[PDB]
Structure formats: structure tokens, C-alpha cells
Design a protein around this nucleic acid. Structure first.
Ligand code: NA
Ligand code: NA
Ligand code: NA
Ligand code: NA
Lengths: 216, 460
DNA sequence: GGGGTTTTGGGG
DNA sequence: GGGGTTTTGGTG
DNA sequence: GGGGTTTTGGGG
């Protein structure tokens, strides 16, 4: 039984081809989490791991409406309750986004969250980046392995085996190792991208814009 | 510079004192705030190394050393227990019953590391020789001086360090927790186990498979850059680890930025006994093969003992730099790791073909023996951590006509169209090789631009 | 006081 | 000091 | 000059 709510949610999402509608319904309940950081990176934890929530332009306006005396960029060490949220997969540059792995990211799209101001939460372990967890990293690798295998078994055909003579009687034969390079898919670039899941799309706000909106 | 022994250092002078000592423990240099870095360690010497033995339990006694600095690079990185450290301008005081030496490197204090063994850890990794036996392999500030009168102190402390580590455990049972009791710990704890496996999880992370005296197996992530000295079959001490309650598929240890992984000097009695006592375990692998999806990695092969000391080469260098790198161009035999994405020919029955050694041609045995000697002609499409993101797959050949890799499958070549037993064994192997988390560790020989497997055999 | 440095006698 | 960063958010 | 440190103004 998984104790980390985030790990279980993000895990199922990946194990279900990024289809948020296929994830257990008994897990789409409100999320009460501790705010570890708020700027330059807004990070919340579930007692075990920390994730980066992506607020929609609506979610923030609603917030500022019901809570005029509360600045989001100052919710550090405070607790919030995300009543309306969704999960979706996105392709990113893991070299720049630390909240991802293997150029893939599971985003927590927040639509509505309430700040339970001054509510002390129970003592927990030090929160770690969910995308740095061994099992979750492995779960993601499994995801790519399945996509890669399906693509290769579709792209590679005809059993183009190196003629045995090329490797036999190779005394006076010289070759270039790049001859063993085989394209995995019909991808456009030099990066594998033949995935089946449909990359989610939703306008989200940059943590910087919300900073200016509260203190130019 | 006058050097004083640990037990004889003044507790009242409060004046700057200097000394030589053996490091038995140390955290990793970690940042505390916006301007401070710290490194805590345990030191010992001929005057302070063991507690009143009678009811002590041969427990080790030691002094502590806390080095403060404004920069990460001004603090010592201890990779191995048993080495020597020289400190200048340190203040001693009693901290909870024990001697605590404090030194502000950002002010006037300084340190220098001396290798107890022939080479430092870093030098062993790069196969380098030490300038001399009086040269520090690491030190703070732009300069370090060694006077003639020090040579004796250093040489003697080295002899002592070896006698100490060979006669005592140094890292006593009270300095670490049994892996099978890790879940009972309230917070963090220490570990002393053997590295059974080093699995490259990705570009910057290694996954260590650990097993200690309790017989319990654990996995932990170890960044390559931070711990480049991790080696299979070696015994290490892990400073500060936590039990991962969120891992259900396998036992996982969590490390922090201040955690450290340390090896032992050659003379280590504890390391020697553990290297022999603790034996490899495959129970985790055997069990994982029964699951449709295993979150545990499984190395299905093993290379001949004569290659165990051979360094590995990534697929990236093997297929993208083998014809442009001076070093790679000089070698014909390499060792590497990868996972099979697809196997050709698709029909397992065609894996064994008839071979005519006169026309250098091979053919299907679906027409029987009328083709010549039976040989394996399998083409593996592989991938690894170094090429995990690119849109490529790489061909690794298994052509045994010349005897290379003939026993890879533990099944002698035969007509798979007629030998049901041989066909079934290869079919199961095929499913294991293409199964997620299955990896191959093999030696390959470069021939006419292609890599052929050799001296490698499945172990499942 | 004493570093490294240049300030080469004096701030905080 | 047996600890919790980040222009470093996969040495810190 | 400026840190840390305590010398709290002044050496070399
Ligand atoms: Na001065
Ligand atoms: Na001066
Ligand atoms: Na001064
Ligand atoms: Na002063």
C-alpha cells in the first residue's frame, strides 16, 4: 500500500499511458498539502515528496477574489487544499526542468485551491523531488521502454541481418561502427518521440507573472 | 608548527592548536545557509582510539572535527576511511562529553589530506601514481607546506593507521544499523554493506544493490559525480541514510546531500571479512522474473572472470566515437551494458542456421542438415543509459561460426526446427531479454565495423 | 594580530 | 556539530 | 581595503 499520495497518483498516470481518465477515481479527491516553497519555485508536499502545481489564470483570480488578504508567493510553510485539479503528461527538457525525468513530466494542474491559514501539519520526513525517486524513475523508464519497443517492432522489419560473410574472413576487411546504427522510429529529429499518449495542453501561469501581479 | 596529540590537546588554552589524525568517518560537505558550508568528521590517533575496554565492547573512541567554510571547495571530501588529515589552527572544546575540534577554513584554518594507501581514491580511479609519499592529494588554500620534521610523524601515523585498521574494526557495531532493522529507526542511520551491483540508472545516477551482514538486500541511488568510486564487490560505509516508506516494490535507502559513501583502506579487517562473508544474492532477481512488470533491474548475464577487471564502455562511445577517439581506436575488445529492445530474426527457430565454411554462407535449416555446421546467427537491437534519449537502437551480433559466444545461451547450437527442448529454452530466454528492466553485461569484439558478443553467458 | 595585498596607514 | 542548498534545483 | 576577530588602533 502506497503511502505517498503524489507517488501513487503520478505512478498510475504513467502506468495508464498518461490518460488521467483511466486513473482510479477514488484518488481524485481533494488534496491537502504542505507548502514547502513558494518562490522562485512553488513546491508542495504530501508528507513524502514535493511536486510543482501549475495554476491556471482562472484558479489564481478565484483565489485573489475569495482571499484578498493572501498572497500566493508568500504561502511558504503554509497549507493549501486543492479542491479541483487534474493530471496530464507533457514533453519537456529535463536538463532545464528539475521537476521531470527523461524529457517527460507529469503536471498537477490546479483549478481551485483554498489556503488553510495557520494550520499546523504533522511532522514528516524531509520531502524529496518525486522525479528523483528510484521507483518513480523506473516507472517512467518502463513507460518509454514500452513506447520504444512498440515503435521499433513497427519500424524494423525484413530481418536485415548483417551478412555472415562480413564478420567471417574479416582479415582484410575494415568497417565503420556507425554501420550498426539503426533508426528506432520515423521520428523527425534525433530524439525519440514516437509516443502514443496525447500530450496534454493547458495554459498555465509562470510563477514569475504571479509575483509581479502581487508586487510589480 | 608544533603538533599535539588528540588526548593531550589543551581544553583550557582555547588557543589555536595543530595536529595530525586518522579519519574514520565524515559527512559530505554540505551547505547550511546563504554563506556557510560544513563538514563533520571523526578522528583518532595513538592516544585516542578506543574506549575503556572491559565493559565497553571494543567500541571505538574518537574526537570530532568540524570544519567551517564559505565555499564548498574549501572543505575536504572523504571518500575512504583510514586516510590521514592534517589540520592547522583549530580550537578544541568539550561538546557533550567529547573532544570537538573546530576550524574556520574561511578565516585562518587549513587542512591537508594524505593517502594512507599507495594511492588516493581519486588516483586509483584514474590509475595515477602519487607525486611522493609526503605530498598531499588534497588541501585547502593555494599552498601547502611539509617540513622535514613532519615526514616522521606522517610515516609513523601511516604505519599505525594500518596496524589499527588490521587489528580492529574501527567502525564498530555501535556506529551503524543492521539493514534488516532499518525500518525500526526513528530517523536517519548509518550502514556498512557490500556493493553487490552498480546499475547505471541514467546519465547522472547509479543504483547500488547493497547487502550487509544481516543478509538483507537494499537499493539506493548514488550520483556518479558525487560517488565515482563505487565498485562492485567492494565494501563501503554509508553515512546517513533513511528507510524509504514509499517504496513497495523493493527496499530502498534514501541519501541526503550531506550523506556520504566511504570505502576502507586495504588493511581494513572489517572490509576484508565482509568481502568474503557477504555473498551475492539473486533471490530478488529470481522473484522478479515471476512478475509481468518488475521495478527491480536484473542483469541476465556474467562475463568470464578474465574480464571482470575490464572497464566498461557506453554505447555512445562504442557506436559514435569508436572511429574518432584515439583511445577507442586502439582497442578491439570492449565491455559494455545494455538492454535488448528487439531480437532478429523474429522467428526463434531461425536463430540457428546452417553454415558452409567454404562459401562463407549460411542458410535456413527448415530444409534440414543440407546446409553445413550449425551456428547461432542472432542480431540484438540494444540501447543503454548513454543513448536513452536518442532515436537510435544499436546492433550487437551473436555469430558463433568462429566460436565467439557459442555458449551464450547455455544451449549448444542445434536445429531448433527439430529439437523442441533447445527451441523452448531459447524462447524463454528471448522473453527474458526483451522484458523491461532486463539488462546484459557482456564483452564484445570489434570486427569489420560490427560488435560480436563473446565470453558472456546467461545466468538465468 | 596577522593574511594577502597594496591599502603601504587605517575601518567597522 | 548526527546536518537541509539550488547562478548547483542529478557533487554541494 | 576588507574578513574575521577582538587586535577594537595599528605591522610588515
Ligand atoms: Na591590515
Ligand atoms: Na596591509
Ligand atoms: Na585589521
Ligand atoms: Na580588527
Amino acid at each position: 500500500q502506497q503511502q505517498s499520495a503524489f507517488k501513487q497518483l503520478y505512478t498510475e498516470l504513467f502506468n495508464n499511458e498518461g490518460d488521467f481518465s483511466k486513473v482510479s477515481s477514488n484518488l481524485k479527491k481533494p488534496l491537502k498539502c504542505y507548502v514547502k516553497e513558494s518562490y522562485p519555485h512553488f513546491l508542495v508536499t504530501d508528507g513524502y515528496f514535493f511536486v510543482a502545481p501549475y495554476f491556471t489564470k482562472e484558479a489564481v483570480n478565484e483565489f485573489h477574489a475569495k482571499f484578498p488578504n493572501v498572497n500566493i508567493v508568500d504561502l511558504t510553510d503554509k497549507v493549501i487544499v486543492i479542491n479541483n485539479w487534474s493530471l496530464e503528461l507533457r514533453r519537456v527538457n529535463s536538463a532545464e526542468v528539475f521537476t521531470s525525468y527523461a524529457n517527460l513530466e507529469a503536471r498537477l494542474i490546479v483549478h481551485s485551491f483554498k489556503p488553510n491559514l495557520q494550520e499546523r501539519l504533522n511532522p514528516t520526513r524531509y520531502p524529496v523531488n518525486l522525479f528523483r525517486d528510484d521507483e518513480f524513475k523506473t516507472t517512467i523508464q518502463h513507460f518509454r521502454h514500452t513506447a520504444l519497443q512498440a515503435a521499433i517492432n513497427k519500424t524494423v522489419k525484413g530481418d536485415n541481418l548483417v551478412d555472415i560473410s562480413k564478420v567471417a574472413d574479416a582479415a582484410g576487411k575494415k568497417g565503420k561502427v556507425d554501420a550498426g546504427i539503426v533508426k528506432a522510429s520515423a521520428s523527425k529529429g534525433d530524439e525519440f518521440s514516437d509516443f502514443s499518449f496525447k500530450e496534454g495542453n493547458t495554459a498555465t501561469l509562470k510563477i514569475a507573472d504571479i509575483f509581479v501581479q502581487e508586487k510589480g | 608548527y608544533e603538533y599535539v596529540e588528540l588526548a593531550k590537546a589543551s581544553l583550557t588554552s582555547a588557543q589555536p592548536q595543530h595536529f595530525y589524525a586518522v579519519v574514520i568517518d565524515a559527512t559530505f560537505p554540505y551547505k547550511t545557509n546563504q554563506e556557510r558550508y560544513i563538514c563533520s568528521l571523526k578522528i583518532v590517533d595513538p592516544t585516542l582510539y578506543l574506549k575503556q575496554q572491559k565493559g565497553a565492547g571494543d567500541a571505538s573512541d574518537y574526537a570530532t572535527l568540524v570544519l567551517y567554510a564559505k565555499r564548498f571547495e574549501d572543505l575536504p571530501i572523504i571518500h575512504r576511511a583510514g586516510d590521514i588529515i592534517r589540520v592547522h589552527r583549530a580550537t578544541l572544546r568539550l561538546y557533550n562529553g567529547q573532544r570537538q575540534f573546530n576550524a574556520n577554513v574561511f578565516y585562518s584554518s587549513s587542512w591537508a589530506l594524505f593517502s594512507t594507501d599507495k594511492r588516493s581514491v581519486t588516483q586509483e580511479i584514474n590509475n595515477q601514481d602519487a607525486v611522493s609519499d609526503t605530498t598531499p592529494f588534497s588541501f585547502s588554500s593555494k599552498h601547502a607546506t611539509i617540513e622535514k620534521n613532519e615526514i616522521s610523524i606522517l610515516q609513523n601515523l601511516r604505519k599505525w593507521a594500518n596496524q589499527y585498521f588490521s587489528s580492529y574494526s574501527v567502525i564498530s557495531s555501535d556506529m551503524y544499523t543492521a539493514l534488516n532493522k532499518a525500518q525500526a529507526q526513528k530517523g536517519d542511520f548509518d550502514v556498512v554493506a557490500k556493493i553487490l551491483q552498480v546499475h547505471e540508472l541514467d546519465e547522472y545516477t547509479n543504483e547500488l544493490k547493497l547487502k550487509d551482514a544481516s543478509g538483507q538486500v537494499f537499493y539506493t541511488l548514488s550520483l556518479k559525480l558525487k560517488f565515482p568510486h563505487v565498485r562492485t564487490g567492494e565494501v563501503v560505509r554509508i553515512r546517513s541514510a533513511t528507510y524509504d516508506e514509499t517504496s513497495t516494490q523493493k527496499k530502498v535507502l534514501i541519501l541526503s546531500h550531506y550523506s556520504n559513501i566511504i570505502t576502507f583502506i586495504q588493511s581494513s579487517k572489517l572490509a576484508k571479512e565482509l568481502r568474503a562473508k557477504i555473498q551475492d544474492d539473486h533471490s530478488v532477481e529470481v522473484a522478479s522474473l515471476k512478475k509481468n512488470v518488475s521495478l527491480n533491474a536484473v542483469v541476465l548475464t556474467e562475463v568470464d572472470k578474465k574480464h571482470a577487471a575490464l572497464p566498461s564502455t557506453s554505447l555512445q562511445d562504442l557506436f559514435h566515437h569508436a572511429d574518432s577517439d584515439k583511445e577507442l581506436q586502439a582497442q578491439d575488445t570492449f565491455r559494455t551494458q545494455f538492454y535488448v529492445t528487439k531480437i532478429e530474426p523474429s522467428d526463434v527457430k531461425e536463430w540457428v542456421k546452417g553454415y558452409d565454411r567454404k562459401t562463407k554462407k549460411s542458410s535456413s535449416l527448415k530444409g534440414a542438415s543440407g546446409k553445413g555446421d550449425n551456428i547461432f546467427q542472432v542480431q540484438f537491437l540494444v540501447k543503454d543509459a548513454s543513448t536513452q534519449l536518442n532515436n537510435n537502437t544499436y546492433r550487437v551480433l551473436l555469430y558463433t561460426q568462429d566460436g565467439l559466444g557459442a555458449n551464450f545461451f547455455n544451449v549448444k547450437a542445434d536445429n531448433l526446427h527439430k529439437n523442441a527442448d533447445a527451441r523452448k529454452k531459447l524462447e524463454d530466454s528471448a522473453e527474458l531479454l526483451t522484458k523491461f528492466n532486463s539488462y546484459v553485461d557482456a564483452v564484445v569484439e570489434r570486427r569489420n565495423g560490427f560488435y560480436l558478443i563473446k565470453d558472456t553467458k546467461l545466468i538465468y
